[PDB]
Assembly symmetry: C4
């Protein structure tokens, strides 16, 4: 039923600078993979920390009971989008235990060992 905990911290965080186009496959698709094996919906709140400015408010998001959910940091926008080419860190909190795992590059980038 309830595996994991309600508070996770990720000291690393970085979205490489790109142009005004769609982020490239050769870039840090830094994602936060979350699992909620529980029977109650997980109301996740993410806080981003920086090296020079104050923390950016609660980024709400939900992870349905008995479900997983990958969250690209780049896709975060409310309250605000994360400044690219900036070192950040994050804290993930939930009402129910969840399992969190940071990935610097998602699954389908590794799917390129094909040559």
């Amino acid at each position: 039923l309830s595996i994991g905990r309600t508070c996770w911290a990720i000291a690393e965080g970085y979205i490489p600078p790109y142009g005004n186009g769609p982020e490239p496959q050769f870039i840090s698709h830094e994602t936060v993979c979350i699992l909620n094996a529980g029977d109650e919906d997980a109301h996740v709140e993410i806080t981003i920390y920086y090296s020079d400015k104050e923390p950016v408010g609660p980024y709400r998001l939900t992870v349905p009971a008995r479900r997983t959910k990958h969250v690209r940091f780049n896709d975060l926008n409310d309250p605000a989008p994360i400044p690219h080419d900036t070192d950040f860190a994050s804290v993930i909190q939930s009402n129910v235990p969840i399992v969190v795992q940071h990935t610097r590059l998602d699954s389908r980038q590794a799917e390129n060992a094909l040559l």
Copy 2:
């Protein structure tokens, strides 16, 4: 002997191309493992039974899982490993070599 590890483990990442779970049972009692696969859009897929004998290790390829059903490829999943006795569970996602020598193969 040793009863290292725990009876419950969770792996948030899981993805098969068109990953292995390494388990160690340093204990004296056989480990009756039950694996549950979670998805992002559908309900969990039933208990995948398996056994890890006492004082033995065992590498389980997720692709080799088939009963209740095979794991859909090109699909992001997650898993929960449970045992009656403490076991040590580990997962490696990015093969250092196969990645380091794929670059060479430009």
Copy 3:
């Protein structure tokens, strides 16, 4: 007032040799309300540990530290396997990418 993390961390691995490439970095987070006075110690396989590398991580702030940028007491010999111990007066969260995984990712990334 997130008093998350602990006052002591250790990294068994350590090794110094575009933009999308990462390297020997120690990312630290201090979600607390008190400034973090971090002290890093570097260990080697053949010589004694190199003194306290002081550094500060302000309350409610993060901070990435390149091992290469460490210089006082002294710079870390490149092409040398080392390890480190990070201590603080207040709880901090410390994260480092396992050398192998790092090199590997950069390999896949490089690959056009």
Copy 4:
């Protein structure tokens, strides 16, 4: 003045046709004993080795030979024990 613990386990192990990085930030030498586990046969005796006080030490599994060398192209696992706390990391 010690970090880490006296026991570590590694579920993965494989030498194709892997290094254990240890750190001993303590003031007492660490007498490490490694046990290799397999999927079909019993565990292979104590592989002794020492990690000097305030020192690190990388140990290639391939370099292990006493009691015996580790069969290549074979999936194995290991348990690392010490008389004093050490920090271990598989690579």
